Every structure is written in C-alpha cells, then in structure tokens.
C-alpha cells in the first residue's frame, strides 16, 4: 500500500534559515579545510527538501 496525504513544496528563493544552521555556517572557515564542512554535513546533512 502506497498512501499519499499531502503534497509539500518549499519556496525557491529568499528562504529563512534556522538559527543553529545560520550560526554553524557563519563559523565556517573561509579557507578550505574539509573537516569543518564534514562536521557541517554530519550535524545537518548535505541536502534539503
């Protein structure tokens, strides 16, 4: 059984980020240092819906 109960769409532009994600992006080093971006992904994943 596949049941579907709503359709969701996110706006394409001018999204309002979460405080925690906002802060964690701010703290990202301008220099490429993989481990910090990896920690970003580990905390919040790689993708949004």
């Amino acid at each position: 059984s596949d049941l579907e109960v709503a359709h969701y769409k996110l706006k394409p532009r001018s999204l309002m980020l979460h405080y925690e994600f906002l802060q964690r992006v701010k703290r990202l080093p301008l220099e490429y240092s993989y481990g910090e971006y990896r920690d970003l992904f580990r905390d919040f994943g790689t993708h949004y819906i």
Binding site: S1, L3, E4, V5
Partner: protein, 49 residues
C-alpha cells in the same frame, strides 16, 4: 513324471498432480480522506468491489 513353471508379474503405477493458483489485483483511488482511501483500497478478496 516331470513338471516346470515360470511365472512373472510386472506392474507400474505412475501418477502426478500439479496446481497453479494465481491471484492479483490493484485498487487505486484519488480523492477522499486518507483513512477511507486506505480502508477501501485494501482488497477484500471476498468482495473486490
């Protein structure tokens, strides 16, 4: 006096049976409350309507 018999029996009873039973079906619904969708789309084999 002299006598002699030779006597023989051979019997073969082969048999076989097979049965294939196949049932399929797919209710599909659009519109209506998701509870009534699931409650109707579930195939009751004694009343597929």
């Amino acid at each position: 006096s002299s006598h002699g018999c030779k006597e023989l029996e051979n019997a073969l009873k082969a048999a076989s049976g097979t049965q294939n039973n196949v049932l399929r079906g797919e209710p599909f619904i659009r519109g209506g409350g998701a509870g009534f969708i699931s409650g109707l789309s579930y195939l009751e084999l004694d009343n597929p309507a």
